[PDB]
Design a protein around this ligand. Structure first.
Ligand SMILES: [Mg+2]
Ligand SMILES: [Mg+2]
Lengths: 85, 116, 148
């Protein structure tokens, strides 16, 4: 049962906390049927943001291959520091 | 009485001088490269898009844009997650090292805060 | 008073006339002083937000004669202590976090200074204290010490 209130009441606790920080930077696509050359600048605006979203990513990523490393080093710097003597 | 051992280190030092002198320049390459491995890898998940003519198509393209946008941001999320996640792990091995060895964790705290 | 010497060497023109006018916002009457109850109102006054367990301590370690001041002497002393992880990466290279006889062989062969299969197996005998055949980062900051 401790595997059904720990891992069960934490990932679900992650979901809302997940889905939530999402319906806000998510500006409802309102503009439906008005004028013609708005989309212009606009498309690349939603895009410009679009671009962003994504761009923040790789950064978000590669910064992980750095620590997945800094990690090891440490880990070993830890397995090189034991010695019961 | 091994005296001539003033040049064997000189080297080793005059030497280690070479070691670093290498990695240094090697630092800003894997970067100006990691700089391109970047934009090159980026040129396509959403390339130099274009603007059509008039009607029913723009209205749509959008849909997807916003559509995948979430498809994107989503993964952008799974990220900061598996990120802060892998962010904490390091910090839990941060504690393991100081208390046994004696290195301390004061360094990271101060600097980082402001930016993020 | 020995600290004050190196201490003044560190100070160069664009930050001796600067570490002045504000440090002064601590003194008050030609005769030598400076205070510290504005020790925190000025730290940040330069971009340093010291927590209060880092604001009660900065008050518990400094000042010991009674002058209840702090000049430009024992001052810029409390203003120095407040890439070797890089090179490890451009040397460790392969991700095993370690660096053995060959890679070093490599790097020591990846440079421009002449060396030998004899200039290599001699260096490995000085940074690997524990005795093994690699060099923990721990022993990566000790050999590489003194070098640029
Ligand atoms: Mg290796
Ligand atoms: Mg070692």
């Amino acid at each position: 049962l401790a595997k059904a209130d720990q891992k069960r009441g934490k990932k679900q606790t992650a979901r809302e906390t997940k889905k939530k920080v999402l319906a806000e930077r998510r500006k409802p696509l309102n503009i439906d049927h008005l004028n013609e050359d708005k989309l212009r600048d606009k498309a690349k605006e939603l895009w410009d943001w679009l671009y962003q979203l994504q761009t923040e990513k790789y950064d978000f990523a590669e910064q992980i291959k750095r620590k997945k490393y800094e990690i090891v080093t440490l880990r070993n710097r830890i397995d090189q520091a034991q010695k019961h003597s | 009485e091994e005296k001539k051992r003033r040049a064997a280190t000189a080297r080793r030092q005059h030497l280690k001088s070479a070691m670093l002198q290498l990695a240094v320049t090697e630092i800003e390459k894997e970067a100006a490269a990691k700089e391109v491995e970047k934009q090159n890898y980026l040129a396509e998940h959403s390339p130099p898009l274009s603007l059509p003519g008039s009607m029913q198509e723009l209205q749509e393209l959008s849909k997807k844009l916003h559509a995948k946008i979430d498809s994107v941001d989503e993964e952008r999320y799974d990220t900061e997650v598996k990120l802060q996640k892998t962010n904490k792990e390091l910090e839990d091995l941060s504690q393991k090292l100081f208390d046994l060895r004696g290195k301390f964790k004061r360094p990271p705290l101060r600097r980082v805060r402001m930016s993020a | 008073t020995d600290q004050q010497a190196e201490a003044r060497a560190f100070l160069s023109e664009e930050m001796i006339a600067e570490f002045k006018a504000a440090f002064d916002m601590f003194d008050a009457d030609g005769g030598g002083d400076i205070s510290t109850k504005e020790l925190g109102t000025v730290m940040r006054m330069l971009g340093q937000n010291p927590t209060k367990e880092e604001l009660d301590a900065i008050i518990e370690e400094v000042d010991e004669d009674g002058s209840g001041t702090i000049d430009f002497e024992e001052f810029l002393v409390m203003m120095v202590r407040q890439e070797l992880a890089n090179c490890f990466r451009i040397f460790d290279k392969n991700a095993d976090g370690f660096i053995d006889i060959e890679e070093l062989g490599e790097i020591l062969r990846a440079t421009g200074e002449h060396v030998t299969e004899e200039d290599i197996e001699d260096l490995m005998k000085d940074s690997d204290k524990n005795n093994d055949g690699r060099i923990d980062f721990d022993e990566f900051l000790k050999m590489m010490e003194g070098v640029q």
